[PDB]
Design a protein around this ligand. Structure first.
Ligand SMILES: *[C@@H]1O[C@H](CO)[C@@H](O[C@@H]2O[C@H](CO)[C@@H](O[C@@H]3O[C@H](CO)[C@@H](O)[C@H](O)[C@@H]3O)[C@H](O)[C@H]2NC(C)=O)[C@H](O)[C@H]1NC(C)=O
Ligand SMILES: CC(=O)N[C@@H]1[C@@H](O)[C@@H](O)[C@@H](CO)O[C@@H]1O
Ligand SMILES: *[C@@H]1O[C@H](CO)[C@@H](O)[C@H](O)[C@H]1NC(C)=O
Ligand SMILES: *[C@@H]1O[C@H](CO)[C@@H](O)[C@H](O)[C@H]1NC(C)=O
Ligand SMILES: *[C@@H]1O[C@H](CO)[C@@H](O)[C@H](O)[C@H]1NC(C)=O
Ligand SMILES: *[C@@H]1O[C@H](CO)[C@@H](O)[C@H](O)[C@H]1NC(C)=O
Ligand SMILES: *[C@@H]1O[C@H](CO)[C@@H](O)[C@H](O)[C@H]1NC(C)=O
Ligand SMILES: *[C@H]1O[C@H](CO)[C@H](O)[C@H](O)[C@H]1NC(C)=O
Ligand SMILES: *[C@H]1O[C@H](CO)[C@H](O)[C@H](O)[C@H]1NC(C)=O
Ligand SMILES: *[C@H]1O[C@H](CO)[C@H](O)[C@H](O)[C@H]1NC(C)=O
Ligand SMILES: *[C@H]1O[C@H](CO)[C@H](O)[C@H](O)[C@H]1NC(C)=O
Ligand SMILES: *[C@H]1O[C@H](CO)[C@H](O)[C@H](O)[C@H]1NC(C)=O
Ligand SMILES: *[C@H]1O[C@H](CO)[C@H](O)[C@H](O)[C@H]1NC(C)=O
Ligand SMILES: *[C@H]1O[C@H](CO)[C@H](O)[C@H](O)[C@H]1NC(C)=O
Ligand SMILES: [Ca+2]
Ligand SMILES: [Ca+2]
Ligand SMILES: [Ca+2]
Ligand SMILES: [Ca+2]
Ligand SMILES: [Ca+2]
Ligand SMILES: [Ca+2]
Ligand SMILES: [Ca+2]
Ligand SMILES: [Ca+2]
Ligand SMILES: [Ca+2]
Ligand SMILES: [Ca+2]
Ligand SMILES: [Ca+2]
Ligand SMILES: [Ca+2]
Ligand SMILES: [Ca+2]
Ligand SMILES: [Ca+2]
Ligand SMILES: [Ca+2]
Ligand SMILES: [Ca+2]
Ligand SMILES: [Ca+2]
Ligand SMILES: [Ca+2]
Lengths: 5, 1129, 244
């Protein structure tokens, strides 16, 4: 996914 | 014209006195004009200057091969020295008087009697050999030896030809000569010769002392270990790691990585100053330049080597390229060299490097059989370097050119895990994490270490405090600062055209065109990662940073932007949930905001009107804040997954990207009104945004299609850039001049491509961990004017906020709880519509800083608010400490529970370590494991591996070199016993690679094997677009798109020939350019009467329509029905 | 009511013309009668966000702030402005804060545009010709086309002031347009171009008929008028080749 965390 | 050699050949002039024949006569060498050669050159036996990198390259560049001279160590040890004999079995050179002495001194017993191969100590042949000096019996026959100055001749085993014994290793301390009476040792000035062979320091220079880190506090002791005095004790749970001294200033320096500080005292123990505390978050080792009064430091959170004055000012970075894991450092200011070692670069190769004392001409000094070089020291009169290793477990020495490599100690029994090292006279003092002590050893050849001082904690760097350790020399920068504007750093004595120094500039500036002048830096690349926010120049050759890196003890930096008018940068940290401002030079860290932040994913600066915009992924909004006063208001409120924002101050527009499933890029006035989409067709995960100021064109990138696009500010004229190889998941993007610098996640690297097409992908950085963002700092771009910043006017005449608007106009606004006055210019209290509310609600202690933390975190010993407010004045009769913390019996102080009874006093009254239940019950570790002394449980295969696993050393005691091991272990040749998990892993864990030699690459049925058999890679990396194999066999044979068509499961857009996934076909959203994917051949979905579905959101219960929660993600369930319950509760 | 309706973005005046809403209550008589500036309307109106708000409530574009031209009325567009230094050895400090080189003082036009005309306290060598009329003590020497013309060109000078227009609706040698007020000489009356917006200088019948013109001017078929020497001279004077 494109999740920063 | 060519030179007429005596042979008649026309010879080019470039070879005239090149120390080569060039023809028969050698007339070109008749008269010579060479110089002393440069610092970056090696001198052959003939006087030839050749490049330094050609030394020990494997090719005999100099005649007689003077440039190699045994670069390798642990050779077969043939032609042993006179008065020494070679053991036939092991090849060990041993003393002649030890042959047949009754001691099987060699490991194979080659110097003793045995009957199994007919080599008893019986005398057979010396009676007829009749050596001219002395014939002695050996198990393999009679042999002859000769007095000093001769070597036994193997031609007849009778005679001995003259030989210079002065060349042998360890014959005399310091230099020696053969001028008269054969060999004759001599001692350098200041030293006095003793015993005939030994050079001792004159008593005119005071007694010597040795300062070493105990592991918690710095010590000092005599050269024999009689009385040890604690010079300095580390407070606040610190630990002294590196030590160095400046004799003339009577100063002792040390670094404290657990406090992230460095210090300095006198040897008396008084006058302590905290030198550095910014960006020094893990200083490993240290070195002073006693000639230029400078301090060289090693940092390993962001790997760099710095130089700073003894008072801690004018810090400048010297080496930052490819370090990886620098650990050791040493200096020779008299010559001008800087030596350092790292146990692994960004590339795979560990090495020990040499460079001028300002960086410049780096050279790999030792590259073979290196392991983990953990510490370096220099013999300043013999001109040799000494370093240790923690994996191959040896102590070696090479000359300044790395020529003569000689071991002084080797073996897992003698030097199991050295860290630090320093020498004096005939001794070398090295530390040890496994034997847990400072060790004293001879500098020439050592077979048994002596415990100088045994600690109970891991020791660290050692230095010998003495005058001769820092010989005098002239200081080239000694007057006029060498003409340098800011900071004068010594180079090699021959560099800079014989001046011996090169000028640098502090982090806020850079050198002028004519040198000697430091002018402010105009532009540089600014990027952010989870460990640090850094600034690097665009020119790839100047790889050194141009701003002190921003680091924290917890840190995850995501969004960054600058402020050129004050040389200030802004950056968000995702772990503090705080936004900071900081100058380029590292001074002035102040929080911009810490209230109500969940995950700020980007920042930008409207520099003309002084506004800061940020986007919050947890609140799902974008907020704007002014810097003249802390005005703030959420201008956009109900996004879904917003990401990078950008603001065009002159045009009045702002642009932000939402990457939810109907992904789009929106445009709005800088006010926050007129929010409309401009690009929402064929977009997947629009991570990055930028504006091309030279042409007012907006640039963005995708992570689903891995593409880069650019359009005008209206969304018109949409064009795609070319295919960029190995671009899989770009996040950040910026535009400068004619290049596009893009951050990527799969690579974890920063790549540069041309602005006008796909361009040549040239990598700027690599292996920079979880790199997030990038901005193009430029002191020009941040300039201009509009009605919000105009002379004769105050911030556009608006009280509080003023916002630029398209077509050169200003629109005023102002913060939460304040509406706009009748005149549309000023503001008035608005308590009815936007009532004031507290800093944060109940069940949360409101810190003095903006942030707030749960009340459980108040008075618990850990600094949670990041300003110490939650720990302020604890322990009083009401402000009790939390049960998760240990309260000191008196005084109103209290500490984290994990510090209670941990063998380190913290409570001021000392109740922290009292009455502890020290004894452990009748319990054991599982039978297959091993029980340490302090009851730590470790697998038995870790015992005697020369790595301290118990942290006590109980798993490495009684580790004799008797050759035995455990049945399951794998034994290296005379090095150590490895656990079977570390054999056949692709990395040489033995001193010779014998744990990896000849093993099969058995990929475990879920890994792809590279075609050349170099390695196996995980199957996920197979054909994903990134070359994971050295032969590029990973990305070979991959399925590809048929020409012009799409894949088997990708719908094709009839408008332009692009491909969108099948699950996007007839999904209700027109992905394609003309909506071809929403053709009439499909029917819209419906929902049950107890539920309701919005324009594109999933269906949801009818019960939460108009409820105030974005159930549809499309806000249509609320915009269709305000229905405000305008009545009292 | 005349049987027409304006577009939705135009304010409709009492006289029936349609003007853009941005000109409403802007201290400017846009409708031609002051209907758009009545206190009846301006008391229930707020300036658009992008525009200034003068103290009296009228609206001006923001670029009228500190513009050296008082157009808010109350000098509110100039109030509080921190103007730059004026170099006395080079420029003359006008009464409004403007400063320009002194070669423009007494030059012939009130360059400073200040309300006291401190720039144009005229000090010329006098003796301006009758055509370049001296606009009284505010000595603007200007062509006579800018007088008896309803719109300001001399400040408080001669200009359109009825001092001379009271004689013969203009000077003795010149005619007047009668709508809007504007004065042209004899050689510009029936000269082939409609100087008067109503066409009174080129009437339906120049002379006593369509092309009667004058006792000393030729009669062109299209109705123009040319002098006696202009007939058959080889160039276009009647416009329709009546002379040629
Ligand atoms: C490097 O240069 C410095 C220059 O100061 C040398 O220090 C000086 O050395 C001289 C001679 O050893 C010292 O003189 C003696 O000092 C003792 C102790 O005070 C005194 O009792 C004797 O009567 C005599 O004066 C001098 O004090 C000392 N000065 C300073 C500032 O330290 C240093 O010896 C040189 N070191 C090397 C390795 O070349
Ligand atoms: C003083 C203070 O904390 N002010 C804030 C205010 O700025 C706004 O964020 C509001 C939203 O509910 O919460 C409160
Ligand atoms: C030993 O023999 C070799 C070959 O005959 C000769 O080159 C060398 O000089 C001899 N050395 C001595 C010291 O006898
Ligand atoms: C850091 O060092 C400076 C100068 O010695 C000192 O004033 C300051 O209190 C220290 N603390 C920080 C983190 O700024
Ligand atoms: C290698 O992997 C195979 C499975 O592919 C396994 O059965 C075998 O035991 C492993 N060992 C060798 C060297 O064959
Ligand atoms: C006024 O203008 C002239 C232009 O040459 C300049 O030299 C002078 O310095 C100016 N006066 C002052 C005091 O700045
Ligand atoms: C002209 O300006 C001055 C100074 O503000 C003022 O006293 C005077 O009344 C003004 N006259 C007119 C006609 O505006
Ligand atoms: C070496 O030293 C000599 C003597 O000082 C000259 O300075 C020479 O130029 C030096 N070598 C180089 C390469 O600069
Ligand atoms: C004592 O006061 C502190 C104040 O932070 C906490 O509320 C703590 O929980 C209190 N003690 C107990 C036993 O609840
Ligand atoms: C000790 O405990 C371990 C498990 O932690 C094993 O049960 C082991 O057999 C025990 N041995 C003894 C002697 O008690
Ligand atoms: C090594 O030798 C010793 C002494 O004979 C013991 O036999 C020990 O068990 C041996 N272990 C291995 C693995 O060879
Ligand atoms: C995909 O393209 C490659 C060339 O890039 C080859 O033409 C390959 O045969 C193609 N694959 C299919 C399935 O057509
Ligand atoms: C919704 O209605 C359509 C026809 O309009 C179909 O019957 C469909 O199966 C229905 N689905 C639900 C969930 O009600
Ligand atoms: C005042 O007028 C402007 C321009 O028409 C806007 O309508 C504005 O919303 C008005 N202000 C108020 C308070 O209604
Ligand atoms: Ca030569
Ligand atoms: Ca070589
Ligand atoms: Ca022996
Ligand atoms: Ca991708
Ligand atoms: Ca706390
Ligand atoms: Ca403790
Ligand atoms: Ca171990
Ligand atoms: Ca080891
Ligand atoms: Ca291995
Ligand atoms: Ca791959
Ligand atoms: Ca679709
Ligand atoms: Ca709802
Ligand atoms: Ca008007
Ligand atoms: Ca104005
Ligand atoms: Ca004038
Ligand atoms: Ca006029
Ligand atoms: Ca006319
Ligand atoms: Ca004519």
């Amino acid at each position: 996914x494109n999740x920063x965390x | 014209k060519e030179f007429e050699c005596g042979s008649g050949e026309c010879i080019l002039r470039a070879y005239v006195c090149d120390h080569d024949n060039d023809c028969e006569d050698n007339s070109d060498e008749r008269n010579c004009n060479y110089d002393t050669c440069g610092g970056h050159q090696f001198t052959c036996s003939n006087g030839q200057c050749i490049n330094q990198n050609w030394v020990c390259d494997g090719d005999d560049d100099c005649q007689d091969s003077g440039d190699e001279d045994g670069c390798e160590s642990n050779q077969s040890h043939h032609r042993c020295y006179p008065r020494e004999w070679a053991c036939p079995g092991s090849g060990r050179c041993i003393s002649i008087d030890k042959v047949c002495d009754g001691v099987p001194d060699c490991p194979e017993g080659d110097d003793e009697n045995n009957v199994t191969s007919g080599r008893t100590c019986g005398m057979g042949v010396c009676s007829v050999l009749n050596c001219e000096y002395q014939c002695h019996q050996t198990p393999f026959g009679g042999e002859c030896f000769c007095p000093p100055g001769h070597i036994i001749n193997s031609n007849d085993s009778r005679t001995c030809i003259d030989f210079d014994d002065c060349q042998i290793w360890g014959i005399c301390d310091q230099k020696c000569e053969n001028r008269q009476g054969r060999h004759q040792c001599l001692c350098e000035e200041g030293y006095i010769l003793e015993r005939g062979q030994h050079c001792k320091s004159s008593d005119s220079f005071s007694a010597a002392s040795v300062i070493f880190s105990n592991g918690r506090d710095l010590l000092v002791g005599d050269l024999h270990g009689r009385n040890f005095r604690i010079l300095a004790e580390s407070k606040n749970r610190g630990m002294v790691m590196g030590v160095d001294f400046h004799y003339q200033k009577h100063r002792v320096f040390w670094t404290d990585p657990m406090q992230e500080k460095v210090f300095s005292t006198d040897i008396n123990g008084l006058n302590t100053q905290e030198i550095l505390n910014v960006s020094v978050d893990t200083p490993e080792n240290l070195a002073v330049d006693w000639i230029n009064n400078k301090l060289y430091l090693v940092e390993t959170k962001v790997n760099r080597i710095d130089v700073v004055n003894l008072e801690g000012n004018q810090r400048v970075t010297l080496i930052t390229e490819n370090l990886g894991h620098p650990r050791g450092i040493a200096l020779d200011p008299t010559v001008g060299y800087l030596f350092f070692s790292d146990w692994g670069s960004l590339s795979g190769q560990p090495k020990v490097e040499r460079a001028f004392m300002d960086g410049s001409n780096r050279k790999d000094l030792v590259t073979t059989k290196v392991g983990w070089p953990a510490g370096i020291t220099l013999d300043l009169v013999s001109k040799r370097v000494y370093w240790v290793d923690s994996r191959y477990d040896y102590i070696e020495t090479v000359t300044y050119d790395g020529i003569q490599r000689k071991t002084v100690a080797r073996g897992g029994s003698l030097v199991p895990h050295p860290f630090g090292i320093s020498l004096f006279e005939e001794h070398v003092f090295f530390t040890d994490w496994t034997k847990m002590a400072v060790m004293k050893a001879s500098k020439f050849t050592e077979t048994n270490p002596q415990v100088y001082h045994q600690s109970s904690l891991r020791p660290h760097g050692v230095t010998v405090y003495h005058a001769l350790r820092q010989p005098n020399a002239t200081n080239p920068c000694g007057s006029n600062n060498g003409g340098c504007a800011q900071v004068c750093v010594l180079s090699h004595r021959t560099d800079n055209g014989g001046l011996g120094y090169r000028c640098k500039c502090e982090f806020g500036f850079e050198l002028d065109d004519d040198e000697h002048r430091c002018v402010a830096v105009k532009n540089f690349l600014l990027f952010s990662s989870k460990t640090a926010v850094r600034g690097i120049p665009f020119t790839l050759s100047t790889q050194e940073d141009v701003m002190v890196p921003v680091t924290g003890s917890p840190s995850f930096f995501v969004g960054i932007d600058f402020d050129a008018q004050h040389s200030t940068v802004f950056y968000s940290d995702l772990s503090k949930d705080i936004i900071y401002k900081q100058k380029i030079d590292g001074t002035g860290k102040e929080v911009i905001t810490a209230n109500r932040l969940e995950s700020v994913e980007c920042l930008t600066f409207d520099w003309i009107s002084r506004n800061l915009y940020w986007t919050d992924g947890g609140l799902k909004s974008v907020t704007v804040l002014r810097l003249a006063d802390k005005s703030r208001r959420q201008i956009i409120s109900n996004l879904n997954n917003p990401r990078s924002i950008v603001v065009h101050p002159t045009a009045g527009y702002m642009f932000l990207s939402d990457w939810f499933r109907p992904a789009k890029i929106m445009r709005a006035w800088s006010d926050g009104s007129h929010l409309m989409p401009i690009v929402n067709t064929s977009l997947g995960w629009p991570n990055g945004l930028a504006i091309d100021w030279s042409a007012s064109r907006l640039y963005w990138v995708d992570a689903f299609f891995d593409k880069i696009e650019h359009s005008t500010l209206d969304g018109l004229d949409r064009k795609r850039l070319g295919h960029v190889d190995q671009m899989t998941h770009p996040f950040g993007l910026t535009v400068f001049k004619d290049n596009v610098f893009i951050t990527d996640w799969r690579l974890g690297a920063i790549i540069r491509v041309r602005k006008s097409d796909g361009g040549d992908m040239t990598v700027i950085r690599r292996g920079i961990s979880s790199v997030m963002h990038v901005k193009a700092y430029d002191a020009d771009l941040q300039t201009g004017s509009n009605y919000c910043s105009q002379t004769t006017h105050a911030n556009g005449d608006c009280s509080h906020f003023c916002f630029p608007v398209p077509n050169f106009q200003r629109v005023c606004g102002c913060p939460y709880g304040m509406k706009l006055q009748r005149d549309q210019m000023t503001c008035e209290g608005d308590p009815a519509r936007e009532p004031p509310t507290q800093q944060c609600g109940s069940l949360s202690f409101p810190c003095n800083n903006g942030k707030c933390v749960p009340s459980f975190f108040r008075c618990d010993g850990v600094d949670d608010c990041h300003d110490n407010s939650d720990e302020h004045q604890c322990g009083v009769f009401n402000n009790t400490c939390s049960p998760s913390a240990f309260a000191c019996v008196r005084g109103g102080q209290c500490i984290p529970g994990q510090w209670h009874c941990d063998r380190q006093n913290d409570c001021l009254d000392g109740s922290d370590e009292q009455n502890c239940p020290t004894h452990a019950t009748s319990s054991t570790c599982p039978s297959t494991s091993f029980t340490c002394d302090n009851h730590v449980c470790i697998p038995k295969d870790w015992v005697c591996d020369t790595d301290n696993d118990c942290s006590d050393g109980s798993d490495e005691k009684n580790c004799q070199a008797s050759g035995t091991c455990q049945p399951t272990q794998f034994r290296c040749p005379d090095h150590r016993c490895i656990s079977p998990l570390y054999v056949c892993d692709g990395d040489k864990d033995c001193a010779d690679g014998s744990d990896e030699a000849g093993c099969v690459l058995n990929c475990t049925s879920a890994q792809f094997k590279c075609a050349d058999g170099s390695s196996c890679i995980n199957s996920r990396y197979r054909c994903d677009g990134v070359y994971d194999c050295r032969d590029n066999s990973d990305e070979a044979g991959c399925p590809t798109r048929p020409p012009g068509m799409c894949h088997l499961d990708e719908f094709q857009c009839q408008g332009d020939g692009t491909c969108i996934p099948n699950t996007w076909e007839c999904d209700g959203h027109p992905d394609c350019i003309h909506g071809s994917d929403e053709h009439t051949g499909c029917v819209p979905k419906t929902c049950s009467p107890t539920h309701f579905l919005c324009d594109n959101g999933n269906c949801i219960y009818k019960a939460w329509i108009c409820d105030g929660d974005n159930d549809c993600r499309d806000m249509s369930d609320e915009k269709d029905c305000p229905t405000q319950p305008f009545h009292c509760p």
